[PDB]
């Protein structure tokens, strides 16, 4: 819930500026939070708004834009391998873990909603975790597995005041 007010205050700090350029931490936090909320258009426009000097000065923005492009292309293993390839600063650390587990939950929801029979390897690639613990876990939540063929088969998951207002409006 603090992410919403953080976004509000960061956007306010970006809107008012001596020359329209805020601190690099502000850019990093704003772009990371835009990636967290799955709002790609605003994140891309913010990235294009960044002046070349400040974005070239720090490779943190470059890496976060790389993971943003990975999100754009919807390559989930790319998401899980890019997010753990660089060592990140403190100001952006406690938001990317939320990004990671939110994307994990979204991937689980997508698999449960769309796929009816998925090979265990592809499901493990989507989740980003080894096959064994994912298989046991989905066994507990209630997804039937299949050995030998190694297949996963997930299962899909006051009035009267309004009425008198309506009658009063219609009676004219």
């Amino acid at each position: 819930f603090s992410f919403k007010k953080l976004l509000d205050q960061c956007e306010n700090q970006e809107l008012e500026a001596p020359g329209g350029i805020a601190t690099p931490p502000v850019y990093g936090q704003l772009l990371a939070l835009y990636l967290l909320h799955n709002d790609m258009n605003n994140a891309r426009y913010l990235w294009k708004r960044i002046p070349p000097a400040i974005k070239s000065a720090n490779s943190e923005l470059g890496g976060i834009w790389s993971v943003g492009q990975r999100i754009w292309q919807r390559d989930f293993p790319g998401i899980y391998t890019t997010i753990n390839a660089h060592q990140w600063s403190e100001t952006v650390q406690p938001i990317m873990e939320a990004l990671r587990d939110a994307t994990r939950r979204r991937a689980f929801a997508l698999v449960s909603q769309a796929y009816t029979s998925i090979i265990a390897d592809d499901f493990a690639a989507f989740v980003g975790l080894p096959v064994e613990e994912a298989v046991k876990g989905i066994l507990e939540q209630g997804w039937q597995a299949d050995s030998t063929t190694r297949m996963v088969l997930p299962r899909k998951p006051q009035q009267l005041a309004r009425l008198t207002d309506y009658v009063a409006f219609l009676e004219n």
């Binding site: 956007e11 809107l15 008012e16 500026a17 020359g19 329209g20 258009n41 605003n42 426009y45 913010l46 294009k48 708004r49 919807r74 997508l110 909603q113 769309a114 796929y115 009816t116 029979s117 998925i118 090979i119 592809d122 297949m151 309004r162 309506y166 409006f169």
Partner: protein, 405 residues
């Protein structure tokens, strides 16, 4: 010399209470204040920004109206302070000077490098001159222009989602160049956020202005309309009948490439479209609308699957891949996954035998959520009816009326 008498007269005329004399004397004495260039002490003086808003407004407008202003930062800070700590209601008399000052300010911000710095300032002016939040004004066009050129779309959303009823005449300074531009930059800002319905609505509203001539932005608005209509629908939406005859004779034959795009798109053939868009790349790149035409190319693969939904209960990936011609069963799974993720289709992938199954059971229309949606639609129709009734009641009282019948 005359500055002392001018400021004193402003003092007693503002203290007396009656207002229009100030506005009619300031607008006809600009020559007096434009031949000093040393009235920086007169800008502040004893003129507080609260009570003497019009006096300093005229001074700032005159100071900022001269070409090639030497000092930008000082005037920027002065106008920022004036807008932030303004009066609120006294500005509503000299609306023309306010609009001119804001237009000059937007030009001076955009002229060097940066439109962004003024954005907030403009969003502070909007609320201090318009009578109601649903009241279109010329400054909205400047706000949209600065927003589009600053590549920060979000801050302009609150001033665009709300509908605009009635337009301020602002002493006969609101010509068509401030109304056609606003509804076109609105289409620009919405087409970049993938909200195609409202972008199409704004483009259509911009098309049907009454105009016995051909303008520049009208052609671009028509081109982006013909692109967006193909993007969202599968066909060109017919223009409303209340359109000027100029569009049916001049603008239509001028834009032939886009009509050819529409004609080819109507055949649902994803092969000839690539050749057509490759051949006519020069004009599209010149118009600088690249990105809204590749979306048209990608729309065929999203529409053919929806068309197949109406016929096939289930399919093998190979057959449907050959039908839609994306050259590979593997990419068919990717497209189906994207479609089901974005919610345009209700499909299921079954990889044990190469299956795409089409579950056409989206809703039963018996949950309380549907009742809540119906209630929400009712509370908007009721507001619309109330607004029309209020407008009719206002019309039935005008002394110009009652005598025509």
């Amino acid at each position: 010399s005359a500055l002392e008498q001018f400021v004193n007269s402003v003092r007693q005329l503002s203290a007396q209470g009656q207002m229009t004399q100030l506005c009619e004397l300031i607008n006809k004495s600009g020559e007096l204040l434009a031949k000093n260039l040393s009235h920086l002490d007169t800008v502040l003086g004893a003129l507080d920004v609260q009570e003497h808003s019009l006096g300093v407004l005229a001074v700032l407008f005159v100071k900022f109206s001269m070409p090639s202003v030497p000092d930008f930062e000082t005037l920027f800070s002065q106008v920022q302070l004036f807008i932030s700590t303004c009066n609120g209601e006294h500005i509503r008399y000299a609306t023309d000077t306010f609009a001119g000052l804001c237009h000059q300010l937007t030009n001076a911000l955009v002229e060097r490098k940066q439109p962004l710095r003024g954005i907030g300032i403009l969003k502070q002016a909007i609320d201090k001159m318009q009578m109601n939040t649903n009241q279109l004004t010329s400054i909205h066009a400047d706000l949209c222009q600065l927003c589009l050129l600053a590549k920060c779309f979000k801050p302009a959303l609150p001033y665009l989602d709300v509908d605009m009823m009635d337009i301020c005449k602002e002493n006969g300074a609101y010509d068509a160049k401030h109304f056609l531009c606003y509804y076109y930059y609105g289409g620009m800002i919405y087409t970049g956020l993938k909200n195609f319905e409202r972008a199409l609505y704004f483009y259509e509203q911009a098309i049907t202005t009454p105009a016995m001539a051909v303008s520049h932005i009208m052609l671009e608005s028509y081109k982006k309309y013909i692109l967006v209509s193909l993007i969202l629908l599968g066909k060109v939406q017919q223009l409303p009948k209340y359109t000027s005859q100029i569009v049916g004779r001049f603008i239509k034959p001028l834009s032939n490439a886009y009509h050819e795009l529409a004609q080819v798109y109507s055949t649902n053939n994803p092969s000839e479209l690539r050749n057509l868009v490759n051949k006519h790349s020069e004009t599209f790149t010149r118009d600088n609308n690249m990105g809204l035409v590749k979306q048209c190319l990608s729309s065929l693969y999203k529409k053919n699957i929806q068309r197949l939904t109406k016929t096939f209960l289930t399919l093998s990936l190979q057959d449907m891949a050959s039908r839609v011609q994306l050259s590979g069963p593997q990419e068919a799974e990717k497209y189906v996954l994207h479609m089901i993720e974005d919610g345009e289709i209700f499909a299921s992938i079954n990889q044990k035998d190469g299956m795409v199954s089409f579950h056409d059971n989206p809703e039963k229309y018996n949950n309380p959520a549907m009742l809540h949606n119906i209630d929400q639609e009712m509370l908007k129709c009721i507001e619309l009816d109330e607004r029309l009734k209020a407008m009719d009641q206002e019309i039935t009282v005008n002394p110009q009326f009652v005598q025509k019948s």
